Every structure is written in structure tokens, then in C-alpha cells.
Ligand binder design. Structure first.
Ligand SMILES: C[S@@+](CC[C@H](N)C(=O)[O-])C[C@H]1O[C@@H](n2cnc3c(N)ncnc32)[C@H](O)[C@@H]1O
Ligand SMILES: Cc1ccc(C(=O)O)c(N)c1
Length: 256
């Protein structure tokens, strides 16, 4: 049994009260107060539509993924990754796809900088989409489940679906459950072919073991995964550490 499996079993033993105290203990988060208030009023400039804009920004500002040219955003939801990419100097077009409908996020129309080069298409299940040529491939799909075998299936399905979209392009792909041995096998194969590395984002909650496969990096996947399992396991030991608060992103206004 992996350390990740021990983490998941302990997470599943927590009461709701314990879970709620654990999930943000020692993580980093952006202060969404201002954006939430603006979005409730229907403001269409400056605000990021979700926490996702700051989450992808964390990787971009560290050069782990450097969006450029035609960006595909799989599982765009509200559009946080798409609207953030729309303002980046090297980006020329953003196409977001998301399922939408009951139980899923609809794209939120915005007028943040570069909105005119964004097209968000809901009602699209990416598992039935044929691949398109793109210079940057983004994917933020992977629904958590109390069952790690359900998560294992969901993760492998994402890894198999994204591969045909990868053609010597920039990429950033969520890996929901990176600790199951079958997932590690796929990730190692994918890294041998497409390069890159798996990275834990500090803005992720402790309630998910998600890591992101980014194109610009190297390293040992197994070591990085076990480091996260040990980090998350140790976060059950101590009393709640309030999250480290950071400023949210200002996505500005205007066309390009
Ligand atoms: C973690 S959210 C994406 C958040 C987004 N990156 C942002 O910045 O706002 C993952 C999204 O994938 C969508 N999704 C899940 N399964 C999908 C599928 N089969 N096809 C398309 N979208 C899917 C979910 O509805 C959800 O909105
Ligand atoms: C643009 C669009 C098209 C179809 C659906 C749907 O879920 O049936 C949807 N949620 C959004």
C-alpha cells in the first residue's frame, strides 16, 4: 500500500468538522473577497472568475508552463485559466471546452484583458472531442471521489485522452490521483515521450492529492509523489494552521 493510499484512508476517517479544519491547514490561498463581491454585482472587468486564474498563474510565473499561440483549455469551467491566458503576451487565441449542465460550471462571460481572443464552449464532453492543433494544451479535469479506485480510473482516462493533443507543445495537465501504481506507470511513459515533470501547487487544498504535469521541468515522478503524500500525511498531525493569504490576480480590461 502506497503512502497516498494511507493518506486517503485517513482523510476518509475524518468527521466533517475535522475535514473542514484539515483541508486548508497550511495551504496558500488568494483572498477572493473583492472578486466574489464584484462578480455578484455582474462586474466584467478586473476580476478572475474563479481561484483557477491564480492557480495557473502560479505555474506560469515560475516558467513551468509558458502559454503561447493557440491555447486549448480542457475542462475550462467558469474560465479562470482561459481568461488568465488571454492577457499573456505570447498568446494569440484561447479555446475553452467544458461539460456544463447540471452539476458542472458554466463559462462566465467577462471583459477582462484579451476577452476578444477567447471562445468558451459549454455542453462539450472532452472525452468525445477529436484533438485539435494547438501550441499550448491545458487540462484541469479530475473530479475527486472518496473512492481512490474511482479516482485512479478518472486519472488514467484523463492521461489517455490528453496524449493525442500533445505534439511538442506547452502543457499543464491536472493529475487527480498521482499515487496509484498504474497511474505512476502511465506518467513515467508519458514523461519519457513528452518530457516535463509533476508539480504540487501550494494553492491546492490538502483534501486532494492532485499534482500537475507541466512541460518545462525534469525530475523523478515517484519521489515527487511520495514527498506530497508525506507532506499531506504530516498535515493531519498538528492543529489547524490558517492558510497563507495572498492577493488575487487583476486581469484588467480591454481588447487585443
Ligand atoms: C477544476 S474545474 C476547472 C477550473 C478552471 N481551470 C478555472 O480556472 O476556472 C474542472 C472543470 O472540468 C469540467 N469537466 C469535468 N469533466 C469534464 C468532461 N468530461 N468534459 C469537459 N469538462 C469536464 C467540470 O465541469 C469543471 O468545471
Ligand atoms: C452551450 C451549451 C449547450 C448544451 C448544454 C447542455 O448541457 O445540454 C450546456 N450546458 C451548454
Amino acid at each position: 500500500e502506497t503512502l497516498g493510499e494511507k493518506w486517503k484512508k485517513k482523510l476518509n476517517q475524518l468527521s466533517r468538522k475535522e475535514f473542514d479544519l484539515y483541508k486548508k491547514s497550511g495551504i496558500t490561498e488568494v483572498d477572493r473577497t473583492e472578486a466574489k463581491e464584484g462578480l455578484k454585482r455582474g462586474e466584467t472587468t478586473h476580476h478572475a472568475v474563479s481561484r483557477g486564474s491564480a492557480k495557473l498563474q502560479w505555474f506560469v510565473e515560475r516558467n513551468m508552463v509558458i502559454p503561447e499561440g493557440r491555447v486549448i483549455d480542457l475542462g475550462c469551467g467558469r474560465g479562470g485559466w482561459s481568461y488568465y491566458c488571454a492577457g499573456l503576451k505570447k498568446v494569440t487565441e484561447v479555446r475553452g471546452y467544458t461539460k456544463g449542465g447540471p452539476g458542472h460550471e458554466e463559462p462566465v462571460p467577462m471583459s477582462t484583458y484579451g476577452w476578444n481572443i477567447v471562445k468558451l464552449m459549454s455542453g462539450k464532453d472532452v472525452f468525445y472531442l477529436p484533438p485539435e492543433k494547438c501550441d499550448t494544451l491545458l487540462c484541469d479535469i479530475g473530479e475527486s471521489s472518496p473512492s481512490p479506485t474511482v479516482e485512479e480510473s478518472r486519472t488514467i482516462r484523463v492521461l489517455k485522452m490528453v496524449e493525442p493533443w500533445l505534439k511538442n507543445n506547452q502543457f499543464c495537465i491536472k493529475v487527480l490521483n498521482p499515487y496509484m501504481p498504474t497511474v505512476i506507470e502511465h506518467l513515467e511513459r508519458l514523461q519519457r515521450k513528452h518530457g516535463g515533470m509533476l508539480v504540487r501547487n501550494p494553492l491546492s487544498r490538502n483534501s486532494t492529492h492532485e499534482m500537475y504535469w507541466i512541460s518545462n521541468g525534469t525530475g523523478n515522478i515517484v519521489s515527487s509523489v511520495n514527498m506530497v503524500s508525506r507532506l499531506l500525511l504530516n498535515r493531519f498531525t498538528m492543529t489547524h494552521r490558517r492558510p497563507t493569504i495572498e492577493k488575487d490576480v487583476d486581469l484588467g480590461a480591454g481588447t487585443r
